[PDB]
Write an enzyme that holds these catalytic residues in place. Structure first.
Site, PDB file in Angstrom:
ATOM      1  N   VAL A 122      37.863  58.962  75.398  1.00  0.00           N
ATOM      2  CA  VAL A 122      36.370  59.329  75.366  1.00  0.00           C
ATOM      3  C   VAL A 122      36.344  60.319  76.573  1.00  0.00           C
ATOM      4  O   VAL A 122      36.329  59.915  77.674  1.00  0.00           O
ATOM      5  CB  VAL A 122      35.643  57.809  75.662  1.00  0.00           C
ATOM      6  CG1 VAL A 122      34.237  58.247  75.866  1.00  0.00           C
ATOM      7  CG2 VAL A 122      35.904  56.720  74.542  1.00  0.00           C
ATOM      8  N   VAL A 166      36.096  53.003  74.946  1.00  0.00           N
ATOM      9  CA  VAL A 166      37.073  53.225  76.036  1.00  0.00           C
ATOM     10  C   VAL A 166      38.231  51.989  75.782  1.00  0.00           C
ATOM     11  O   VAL A 166      39.331  52.482  75.943  1.00  0.00           O
ATOM     12  CB  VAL A 166      36.630  53.429  77.390  1.00  0.00           C
ATOM     13  CG1 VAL A 166      37.851  53.461  78.321  1.00  0.00           C
ATOM     14  CG2 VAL A 166      35.691  54.599  77.708  1.00  0.00           C
ATOM     15  N   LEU A 176      41.281  39.513  72.616  1.00  0.00           N
ATOM     16  CA  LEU A 176      40.607  39.917  71.512  1.00  0.00           C
ATOM     17  C   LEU A 176      40.075  41.369  71.348  1.00  0.00           C
ATOM     18  O   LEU A 176      39.537  41.866  72.331  1.00  0.00           O
ATOM     19  CB  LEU A 176      39.413  38.755  71.284  1.00  0.00           C
ATOM     20  CG  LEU A 176      39.843  37.418  70.925  1.00  0.00           C
ATOM     21  CD1 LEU A 176      38.733  36.428  71.267  1.00  0.00           C
ATOM     22  CD2 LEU A 176      40.731  37.047  69.727  1.00  0.00           C
ATOM     23  N   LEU A 201      35.390  30.494  66.062  1.00  0.00           N
ATOM     24  CA  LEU A 201      36.421  30.770  67.017  1.00  0.00           C
ATOM     25  C   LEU A 201      37.405  29.312  66.634  1.00  0.00           C
ATOM     26  O   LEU A 201      37.629  28.368  67.480  1.00  0.00           O
ATOM     27  CB  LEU A 201      35.922  30.306  68.415  1.00  0.00           C
ATOM     28  CG  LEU A 201      35.391  31.668  69.185  1.00  0.00           C
ATOM     29  CD1 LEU A 201      34.026  32.051  68.216  1.00  0.00           C
ATOM     30  CD2 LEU A 201      34.989  31.369  70.554  1.00  0.00           C
ATOM     31  N   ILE A 260      40.107  27.860  69.268  1.00  0.00           N
ATOM     32  CA  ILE A 260      39.319  27.211  70.408  1.00  0.00           C
ATOM     33  C   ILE A 260      38.668  25.901  69.998  1.00  0.00           C
ATOM     34  O   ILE A 260      38.801  24.770  70.482  1.00  0.00           O
ATOM     35  CB  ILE A 260      37.970  27.897  70.963  1.00  0.00           C
ATOM     36  CG1 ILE A 260      38.646  29.462  71.452  1.00  0.00           C
ATOM     37  CG2 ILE A 260      37.630  27.280  72.243  1.00  0.00           C
ATOM     38  CD1 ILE A 260      40.139  29.371  72.055  1.00  0.00           C
TER      39      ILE A 260
HETATM   40  C1  LIG Z   1      27.250  62.625  83.210  1.00  0.00           C
HETATM   41  O1  LIG Z   1      28.104  62.374  82.457  1.00  0.00           O
HETATM   42  P1  LIG Z   1      28.880  60.751  82.343  1.00  0.00           P
HETATM   43  O2  LIG Z   1      28.927  60.401  83.546  1.00  0.00           O
HETATM   44  O3  LIG Z   1      30.073  61.710  81.788  1.00  0.00           O
HETATM   45  C2  LIG Z   1      27.899  59.304  81.322  1.00  0.00           C
HETATM   46  C3  LIG Z   1      26.360  59.321  81.907  1.00  0.00           C
HETATM   47  O4  LIG Z   1      28.387  58.179  81.907  1.00  0.00           O
HETATM   48  C4  LIG Z   1      27.966  59.350  79.787  1.00  0.00           C
HETATM   49  S1  LIG Z   1      26.963  59.558  78.476  1.00  0.00           S
HETATM   50  C5  LIG Z   1      27.950  59.691  77.308  1.00  0.00           C
HETATM   51  C6  LIG Z   1      27.651  60.052  75.722  1.00  0.00           C
HETATM   52  C7  LIG Z   1      26.361  59.183  75.204  1.00  0.00           C
HETATM   53  O5  LIG Z   1      26.387  59.525  74.002  1.00  0.00           O
HETATM   54  P2  LIG Z   1      25.187  58.676  73.121  1.00  0.00           P
HETATM   55  O6  LIG Z   1      25.183  59.188  71.926  1.00  0.00           O
HETATM   56  O7  LIG Z   1      25.050  57.350  73.465  1.00  0.00           O
HETATM   57  O8  LIG Z   1      23.924  59.569  73.866  1.00  0.00           O
HETATM   58  P3  LIG Z   1      23.411  61.171  73.715  1.00  0.00           P
HETATM   59  O9  LIG Z   1      24.202  61.571  72.366  1.00  0.00           O
HETATM   60  O10 LIG Z   1      23.684  61.793  74.838  1.00  0.00           O
HETATM   61  O11 LIG Z   1      21.610  61.041  73.687  1.00  0.00           O
HETATM   62  C8  LIG Z   1      29.060  59.481  77.893  1.00  0.00           C
HETATM   63  C9  LIG Z   1      30.421  59.387  77.066  1.00  0.00           C
HETATM   64  N1  LIG Z   1      29.386  59.371  79.273  1.00  0.00           N
HETATM   65  C10 LIG Z   1      30.765  58.931  79.727  1.00  0.00           C
HETATM   66  C11 LIG Z   1      31.067  57.541  79.700  1.00  0.00           C
HETATM   67  C12 LIG Z   1      32.204  57.290  79.052  1.00  0.00           C
HETATM   68  N2  LIG Z   1      32.809  55.936  78.988  1.00  0.00           N
HETATM   69  C13 LIG Z   1      31.960  54.915  79.513  1.00  0.00           C
HETATM   70  C14 LIG Z   1      32.625  53.396  79.366  1.00  0.00           C
HETATM   71  N3  LIG Z   1      30.905  55.050  79.900  1.00  0.00           N
HETATM   72  C15 LIG Z   1      30.291  56.485  80.172  1.00  0.00           C
HETATM   73  N4  LIG Z   1      29.091  56.185  80.663  1.00  0.00           N
HETATM   74  C1  LIG Z   2      44.923  29.467  73.264  1.00  0.00           C
HETATM   75  O1  LIG Z   2      43.717  29.684  73.414  1.00  0.00           O
HETATM   76  P1  LIG Z   2      43.285  30.986  74.146  1.00  0.00           P
HETATM   77  O2  LIG Z   2      44.162  31.333  75.298  1.00  0.00           O
HETATM   78  O3  LIG Z   2      41.772  30.484  74.891  1.00  0.00           O
HETATM   79  C2  LIG Z   2      43.244  32.646  72.832  1.00  0.00           C
HETATM   80  C3  LIG Z   2      44.496  32.814  72.010  1.00  0.00           C
HETATM   81  O4  LIG Z   2      43.091  33.803  73.795  1.00  0.00           O
HETATM   82  C4  LIG Z   2      42.013  32.809  72.058  1.00  0.00           C
HETATM   83  S1  LIG Z   2      41.934  32.996  70.185  1.00  0.00           S
HETATM   84  C5  LIG Z   2      40.137  32.818  70.150  1.00  0.00           C
HETATM   85  C6  LIG Z   2      39.389  32.677  68.989  1.00  0.00           C
HETATM   86  C7  LIG Z   2      39.743  33.450  67.687  1.00  0.00           C
HETATM   87  O5  LIG Z   2      38.763  33.431  66.828  1.00  0.00           O
HETATM   88  P2  LIG Z   2      39.091  34.218  65.606  1.00  0.00           P
HETATM   89  O6  LIG Z   2      37.940  33.991  64.208  1.00  0.00           O
HETATM   90  O7  LIG Z   2      39.536  35.642  65.933  1.00  0.00           O
HETATM   91  O8  LIG Z   2      40.448  33.418  64.956  1.00  0.00           O
HETATM   92  P3  LIG Z   2      40.619  31.983  64.340  1.00  0.00           P
HETATM   93  O9  LIG Z   2      39.086  31.355  63.952  1.00  0.00           O
HETATM   94  O10 LIG Z   2      41.288  30.952  65.277  1.00  0.00           O
HETATM   95  O11 LIG Z   2      41.243  32.342  63.087  1.00  0.00           O
HETATM   96  C8  LIG Z   2      39.725  32.999  71.530  1.00  0.00           C
HETATM   97  C9  LIG Z   2      38.084  32.966  71.715  1.00  0.00           C
HETATM   98  N1  LIG Z   2      40.619  32.941  72.170  1.00  0.00           N
HETATM   99  C10 LIG Z   2      40.344  33.042  73.739  1.00  0.00           C
HETATM  100  C11 LIG Z   2      40.018  34.800  74.400  1.00  0.00           C
HETATM  101  C12 LIG Z   2      38.775  34.708  75.026  1.00  0.00           C
HETATM  102  N2  LIG Z   2      38.387  35.983  75.426  1.00  0.00           N
HETATM  103  C13 LIG Z   2      39.149  37.006  75.034  1.00  0.00           C
HETATM  104  C14 LIG Z   2      39.008  38.394  75.714  1.00  0.00           C
HETATM  105  N3  LIG Z   2      40.547  36.970  74.324  1.00  0.00           N
HETATM  106  C15 LIG Z   2      40.884  35.815  74.173  1.00  0.00           C
HETATM  107  N4  LIG Z   2      41.939  35.583  73.570  1.00  0.00           N
HETATM  108 MG   LIG Z   3      37.555  32.544  63.036  1.00  0.00          MG
END
Ligand SMILES: COP(=O)(O)[C@](C)(O)c1sc(CCOP(=O)(O)OP(=O)(O)O)c(C)[n+]1Cc1cnc(C)nc1N
Ligand SMILES: COP(=O)(O)[C@](C)(O)c1sc(CCOP(=O)(O)OP(=O)(O)O)c(C)[n+]1Cc1cnc(C)nc1N
Ligand SMILES: [Mg+2]
Ligand SMILES: Cc1cc2nc3c(=O)[nH]c(=O)nc-3n(C[C@H](O)[C@H](O)[C@H](O)COP(=O)(O)OP(=O)(O)OC[C@H]3O[C@@H](n4cnc5c(N)ncnc54)[C@H](O)[C@@H]3O)c2cc1C
Ligand SMILES: Cc1cc2nc3c(=O)[nH]c(=O)nc-3n(C[C@H](O)[C@H](O)[C@H](O)COP(=O)(O)OP(=O)(O)OC[C@H]3O[C@@H](n4cnc5c(N)ncnc54)[C@H](O)[C@@H]3O)c2cc1C
Ligand SMILES: *C1=C(C)C(=O)C(OC)=C(OC)C1=O
Ligand SMILES: *C1=C(C)C(=O)C(OC)=C(OC)C1=O
Ligand SMILES: COP(=O)(O)C(C)=O
Ligand SMILES: COP(=O)(O)C(C)=O
Ligand SMILES: [Mg+2]
Ligand SMILES: [Mg+2]
Ligand SMILES: [Mg+2]
Ligand SMILES: [Mg+2]
Ligand SMILES: [Mg+2]
Ligand code: NA
Ligand code: NA
Ligand code: NA
Ligand code: NA
Lengths: 592, 592, 182
Positions: free
Chosen positions: B24, B50, B420, B475, B478
């Site tokens: 991105v 990202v 996830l 979930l 869980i």
């Molecule tokens: C001044 O430039 P920048 O700091 O590079 C900025 C403000 O931070 C922005 S704005 C932007 C694009 C926004 O596209 P939208 O369609 O949402 O908006 P627009 O088309 O500009 O009206 C991206 C990719 N990033 C970059 C960006 C990339 N990845 C993440 C997680 N956050 C961001 N915010």
């Molecule tokens: C053994 O339990 P856990 O480690 O707690 C585990 C495997 O890690 C999982 S699996 C799970 C739910 C999955 O729900 P889905 O509908 O995808 O799957 P299912 O309904 O179980 O077939 C969550 C919330 N988390 C927890 C989880 C929460 N947040 C993030 C970012 N990643 C996770 N992966």
């Molecule tokens: Mg499920």
């Protein structure tokens, strides 16, 4: 007496004022969920991404003074998914409390499933990040967490809870629990008298009112001080709303992007910047040499090491903005009674004249739609009590240039970090904080896609708001930044949608997606259909009590006004010097 | 001679074998994008989060030995959005190269817009995380990055590039650039001879073949060694595929969740575990006391400090798995020629007998659908060249219990971190690595929602694969873990969809969402409609060349088999001892 | 109005009640010694090991309620020689203020002679350990330091001063400086 550490934690959270949490459970945080169920005092909202929960917590904090959004998650990748919010909250001096489950203490160095060193990862973006090592410390760490979140320069805290620590029994007496005192330095009378003497000597001063004014809940005092002294007020983006946009002293905003032609011109004409709870961000100042040329600078900040960080003030004062403004008002009143405050009619008139003339056109009848026109229609459709939530992009920049706000905490924006995806969850968090708030979000298409699934949280929990989606099938801001490189490269989101010829090659069909996620959606192609779409959105909200998305199909390419210095902002699109072209400026339109 | 640092970087990436990047763009990383456009050798795929780009890079790495997925992003919240992938890649000993833009060097301590200390945040989850401080160092940091990603225990690297560093000119001669040597320790003959002497003395040995075997590209040697010695092979989840599931020595998988009744029973009956490129994960072992009871343990690992970390081996050898297996084969051949390898017909027969009898039922005609039946239908519909991609949940656990794989790198799973949202982007990354691979993803509903928008990346770039979505509006994992707390709390995703009465209160309409994002989708309610849905999905893939989602509506609640020890796995659903109930076990069905 | 950051530092130390320092000079901290000589309010005691200066600071603090021992040193090994005292002070909940000289800011990543990341080394054994990156922040970092040394559970602070930061001119009004609340 005897309960689990997590049961004690619920009593602490209750006494510290928590009534809401956003989160995603998992095996490692289940004891905490168990405690939350038994205690019953906290409403839980289930996010559809841990990052979503984290930005909901941010919105909740930002909505109302004293709020602290809580984000819950499991071990391993849940904590890593909260880093972007910890960063964003830190960056803007606002608190969220993140709570993560963790592997049992004895297993922390053993590569247990989903065991990560979240303490080390989160340390750089938090006031405290701690793995709690004893059950008895759980209430004490939370107690200290609240002190730090509220004290000094506010910021977020992460508390990491080993499973065995959560379930172990401790003795806890809820009746003996008391929140700690909050540390806030206060300016002395001697500091404030010098500041006001300096202000009295300026011929063309402006107050730059920052986010610290809002953080301190001091909007009414800021306006009172400006009125007593007859000094124009330039809010920073983070201060926006701390004086109403239709106040006769509100002189516009300043900077390289989210700024007004009249704001920049006023700043450059001034001979003093009286900074209250601001920090002179680079997108506000451009080069500090140019920002401070010919100007005395006063800087009031709660954080000593913010003063002199990017520019040297003539007078820097360490103070909470409310404490400072209380004394500034009292001293200004004494000066008024002694006949020592100068009359500023000519300077104020000059600022208002710029505000009347140095405009940008919004009233475009073009098809495809010009984004400027969307903001005009938003100003007309919503009341003065509207609360806008947005992130970053041409969407947000032009919004800040063209929308109006009238109340503090009615511009909710992650100004320093700008993480895409923030808008939807943050808006849901504001709504959860205040179910009577009239929340209107603004996103570009890319922002709206990052965490699009969070719309289903609004559907499941019946959390209504209006989401304005301005779709150019582009990373528009990045296209515009790439002009310096003579390219347009890896920034287009368009494709022929095999399920929707009606999106005309714009790619994602946001109406089908929003409806699939349980919400309502209206697509607009013509500028005269925007106003009726907003009326329909209000009706659908009332009827179904879910988010309603109003998608406007924009022209692909519009260069929004911006530059590298205050005196160098390029106007690519038509400017205006008359109301017909810019009919929703406060000078020309009565709000509510 | 003279070019920008970023132009030099493109030559380095090309010489290091990079042909693909996921990312991105943003203002801070635009110079790098500019260089990538001028050079032309790298295909860029634009993600819609990202985090999505970061997990695409992980899938790309995992697909094919020697691959290094590249993830690009801007400053500030882009880097923070890559932490979860850095963690996941580290956790599984695989490399990705993350590259972030950054504020100019002179502005790093000045709270510039979107300037964050990504070096400090990423340090805990990377082999190297570095803000490059000089233009001339850009090629050298990348050169060292590749050495570290390939050497020792593999892991990821983050390179953070200040804008001014990117654009500054250096002198660089591409013809003089050479990748560095890769450090891999190799076992001595003396080590390997002791290991084989110990193996010869065991009466009931098993080889536990871990992810290190796949990392080392040593699957064929692992199988050769097992065949020469006539020793059953238990792959770890991360080793799964390094010997085909229909090989007569493949004895099943072991552990608390992703494991077979026959695998656990074989492990507990064995008198030796010969561990090659494994690390005895807690969800593989349960309590190590029980895992090692009555068993000699050999552990071969490339990383010294992995040996003795969770259990004490009788013999630990520091070696690359390919180097080790080369010598193990050569020594085994010498032992065979000397008539010194014992005949193991009875032990092998015993292992195969367990594999024939200790099954779980899959063939359910129930409506709503039982998840077990989905896996049966997948085994029948796809060929032996199928490549599965999944994350975590009952979806993934039962998949690992019931699907079959026949080739290394045809189970692509983030086993240690389980973030996830990983499934969709990882699958897209595998497809980008190998456009002839037959990729089938498996997600539960919650996993599928986290980064659902990434489906539009598949639509825009025409990246076809089949995504199996098993929807319980829960979930589920869980919910099941919460049984220990006698609750079902904050784990339901169901609601009455105001746009889709046909989802019967299951909440999100995944067909409308997938179609809105430009993909194709089929919903199945009845078990006999699964097979035709898979046939239709193949046809739609061929015709439209986009992802095709097959959503199966499951019963809300199914408890999948699992427990806290190898000897304690609870079977809640029907077991089976005959093929009619479990017709897709390899003993009963010929694959391809 | 205009004086070097180190001259401003002397007024801050005076207003915060410092009358004594224990130290070993070197090239990198000479601007601070220069300011201390011009200002005249602080008795310097020259140690015969930086570690010795650092434990003198500890003894000074411990002697009398309100006292804060000050330990001065140059860049590089002077700071690494203060770590044991920072640890001891932290460990017993008592403050010392350590001040180190440092290479100029533009040279911090360039392996300049005696340039070390003392901020990272001292972080685990201090309430604050900071390389000051602007001359105007020198008085503010010291102001924050005294707040932290006196507040909550007391503990020590290390302030690391790049040479160029020490000698740069700033605007500083001693009459407007006030210690923070505790
Ligand atoms: C001044 O430039 P920048 O700091 O590079 C900025 C403000 O931070 C922005 S704005 C932007 C694009 C926004 O596209 P939208 O369609 O949402 O908006 P627009 O088309 O500009 O009206 C991206 C990719 N990033 C970059 C960006 C990339 N990845 C993440 C997680 N956050 C961001 N915010
Ligand atoms: C053994 O339990 P856990 O480690 O707690 C585990 C495997 O890690 C999982 S699996 C799970 C739910 C999955 O729900 P889905 O509908 O995808 O799957 P299912 O309904 O179980 O077939 C969550 C919330 N988390 C927890 C989880 C929460 N947040 C993030 C970012 N990643 C996770 N992966
Ligand atoms: Mg499920
Ligand atoms: C694409 C984009 C473009 C932008 N363009 C502009 C632009 O043109 N102009 C612009 O101004 N901004 C712009 N911004 C926003 C900008 O990046 C900053 O977020 C903003 O200018 C900072 O506002 P502030 O100085 O009020 O600081 P804040 O982040 O609100 O903090 C100011 C100070 O408040 C202090 N503080 C906290 N609590 C208190 C309290 N209780 N009492 C006193 N002080 C307290 C803190 O210590 C801090 O130093 C833009 C953002 C984006 C995403
Ligand atoms: C919900 C869920 C349930 C699970 N249940 C189970 C279960 O029941 N059973 C199970 O086994 N797993 C299970 N897992 C997966 C588990 O968490 C681990 O990811 C897995 O067991 C580790 O496999 P491994 O020991 O092969 O280790 P890997 O992570 O593959 O690493 C093993 C070793 O390889 C070494 N190495 C790297 N490169 C080389 C090389 N070139 N040569 C030699 N060595 C090298 C490393 O140093 C490392 O020590 C589950 C995962 C999830 C998400
Ligand atoms: C227009 C402008 C710009 C003013 O400043 C003003 O005084 C506050 C008006 O009248 C109220 C106005 O309409
Ligand atoms: C079933 C099982 C389980 C076997 O082990 C076997 O030998 C390898 C079979 O025949 C090939 C079989 O069908
Ligand atoms: C993702 O980059 P693209 O291929 O989309 C381009 C060449 O503009
Ligand atoms: C998010 O939690 P819930 O309100 O959904 C519950 C009470 O089960
Ligand atoms: Mg308003
Ligand atoms: Mg756009
Ligand atoms: Mg296969
Ligand atoms: Mg998402
Ligand atoms: Mg040098
Ligand atoms: Na209005
Ligand atoms: Na098959
Ligand atoms: Na010493
Ligand atoms: Na510290």
């Amino acid at each position: 007496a005897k309960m689990r550490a997590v049961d004690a934690a619920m009593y602490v959270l209750e006494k510290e004022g928590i009534t809401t949490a956003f989160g995603v459970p998992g095996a490692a945080i289940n004891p905490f969920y168990s405690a939350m169920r038994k205690h019953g005092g906290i409403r839980h909202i289930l996010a559809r991404h841990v990052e979503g929960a984290s930005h909901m917590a941010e919105g909740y904090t930002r909505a109302t003074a004293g709020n602290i959004g809580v984000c819950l998650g499991t071990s391993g990748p849940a904590g890593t998914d909260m880093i972007t919010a910890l960063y964003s909250a830190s960056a803007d001096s606002i608190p969220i409390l993140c709570i993560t489950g963790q592997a049992p203490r004895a297993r922390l160095h053993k590569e247990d499933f989903q065991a990560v060193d979240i303490e080390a990862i989160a340390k750089p973006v938090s006031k405290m990040a701690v793995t709690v090592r004893e059950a008895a410390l759980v209430p004490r760490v939370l107690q200290q967490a609240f002190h730090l979140m509220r004290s000094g320069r506010p910021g977020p805290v992460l508390v990491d809870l080993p499973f065995d620590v959560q379930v172990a029994e401790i003795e806890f007496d809820p009746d003996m629990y008391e929140p700690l005192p909050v540390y806030k330095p206060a300016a002395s009378r001697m500091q404030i008298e010098k500041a006001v003497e300096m202000l009295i000597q300026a011929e063309r001063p402006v107050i730059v009112a920052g986010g610290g004014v809002i953080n301190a809940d001091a909007a009414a005092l800021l306006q009172q001080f400006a009125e007593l002294t007859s000094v124009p007020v330039i809010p920073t983006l983070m201060g926006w709303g701390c004086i109403p946009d239709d106040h006769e002293l509100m002189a516009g905003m300043v900077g390289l992007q989210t700024a007004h032609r009249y704001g920049n011109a006023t700043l450059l004409a001034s001979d003093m910047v009286f900074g209250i709870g601001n920090r002179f961000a680079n997108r506000h100042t451009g080069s500090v040499e140019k920002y401070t040329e010919g100007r005395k600078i006063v800087h009031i900040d709660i954080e000593p090491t913010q003063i002199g960080r990017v520019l040297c003030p003539d007078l820097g004062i360490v103070s909470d903005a409310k404490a400072a403004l209380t004394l500034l008002v009292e001293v200004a009143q004494e000066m008024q009674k002694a006949g020592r405050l100068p009359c500023r009619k000519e300077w104020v008139a000059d600022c208002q004249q710029r505000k009347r003339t140095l405009l940008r056109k919004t009233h475009f009848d073009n098809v495809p739609v010009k984004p400027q026109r969307v903001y005009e229609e938003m100003n007309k459709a919503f009341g003065r009590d509207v609360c806008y939530v947005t992130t970053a992009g041409l969407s947000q920049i032009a919004a800040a240039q063209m929308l109006h706000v009238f109340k503090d905490r009615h511009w909710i924006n992650c100004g320093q970090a700008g993480p895409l995806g923030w808008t939807i969850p943050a808006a849901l968090g504001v709504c959860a904080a205040d179910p009577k708030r009239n929340v209107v979000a603004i996103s570009g298409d890319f922002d709206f896609q990052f965490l699009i699934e969070e719309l289903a949280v609004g559907a499941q929990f019946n959390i209504p708001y209006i989401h304005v989606l301005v779709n150019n099938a582009y990373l528009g801001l990045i296209r515009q930044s790439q002009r310096a490189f003579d390219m347009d490269y890896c920034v287009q989101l368009a494709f022929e949608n095999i399920n929707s010829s009606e999106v005309n090659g714009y790619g994602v069909d946001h109406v089908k997606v929003a409806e699939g996620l349980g919400c309502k959606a209206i697509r607009v192609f013509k500028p005269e259909d925007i106003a009726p779409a907003f009326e329909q959105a209000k009706a659908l909200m009332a009827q179904y009590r879910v988010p309603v998305v109003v998608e406007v199909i924009l022209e692909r390419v519009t260069n929004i006004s911006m530059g590298s210095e205050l005196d160098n902002v390029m106007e690519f699109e038509d400017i205006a010097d008359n109301a017909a072209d810019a009919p929703t400026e406060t000078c020309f339109m009565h709000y509510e």
